[PDB]
Amino acid sequence: DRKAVIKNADMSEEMQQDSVECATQALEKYNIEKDIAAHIKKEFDKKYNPTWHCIVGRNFGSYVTHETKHFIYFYLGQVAILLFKS
Amino acid sequence: DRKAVIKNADMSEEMQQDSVECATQALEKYNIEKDIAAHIKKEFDKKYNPTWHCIVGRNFGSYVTHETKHFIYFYLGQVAILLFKS
């Protein structure tokens, strides 16, 4: 439905496809950004162990510290998702 | 200049005023959100030890895991800032 565009990833490309998919699911289930973000953080906390953090929104800038190979930042249609492991 | 409104804080109110001030400085120096966020994260990494993470923007939702008494989420005029320690 929404065009996934990965803009920056320090992350195995298996995990990338999984990120993009887990976030497709979040957008199919939830309409509000904080609820989308919660679905992805909790799914990644489960599928890949903690501690992940997730920001979903249309206008934001970020600066964060993420364990190597545990960062991704992609759009889904207009909505941008930031997902990373402390 | 911009009206600070703290919307949620798990944080000593000393640190809260410092957060709000460090972010006032960021908005006086930088115009782009990722650059504002970088100024606050780095200043907090310095003034309070790592590891902090910072999101600055007008439209986003979040879900994150933060050490207790190391979270704040406030507006500055229209711009919302999220600052927390992994």
């Binding site: 803009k7 934001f60 970020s62 964060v64 941008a80 | 782009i32 990722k34 923007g57």
Partner: peptide
Amino acid sequence: KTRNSQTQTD
């Protein structure tokens, strides 16, 4: 190990 990252929405 750690690494720092920056993002900006378009």
